[PDB]
Amino acid sequence: TYQCLKGTGENYRGNVAVTVSGHTCQHWSAQTPHTHNRTPENFPSKNLDENYCRNPDGKRAPWCHTTNSQVRWEYCKIPSCDS
C-alpha cells in the first residue's frame, strides 16, 4: 500500500482486509465464523466496510476477525506516515 495508518486507523482508508498474520479477515457483516458484536449495524460510525481492517471496538490499531477457529480477532499491520 502507498496509503498509511492513522494510528488507531478506524476509517483510515480501507485497503488491507487481511490480519497482520496470514489470517483472512472475516467480513464485518458476517456473523460467521465468529459471532461478533462489531458489525456495521453496531459500529456504523467506524465504517465496517466489507472485511477491511477497521477499528470499531477501539483498539490501538486496526483489527478484524479471523476466518480461523485457531484465533478470534487479530491486529493488522498498516504502514504509517506518522512515524
From Swiss-Prot:
Glycans are attached at residue 37. Disulfide bonds join 4-81, 25-64, 53-76. Residues 4-81 form the Kringle domain. This is Angiostatin. It comes from Homo sapiens. The lineage of its organism: Eukaryota, Metazoa, Chordata, Craniata, Vertebrata. The chain holds residues 272 to 354 of 810 of the full protein.
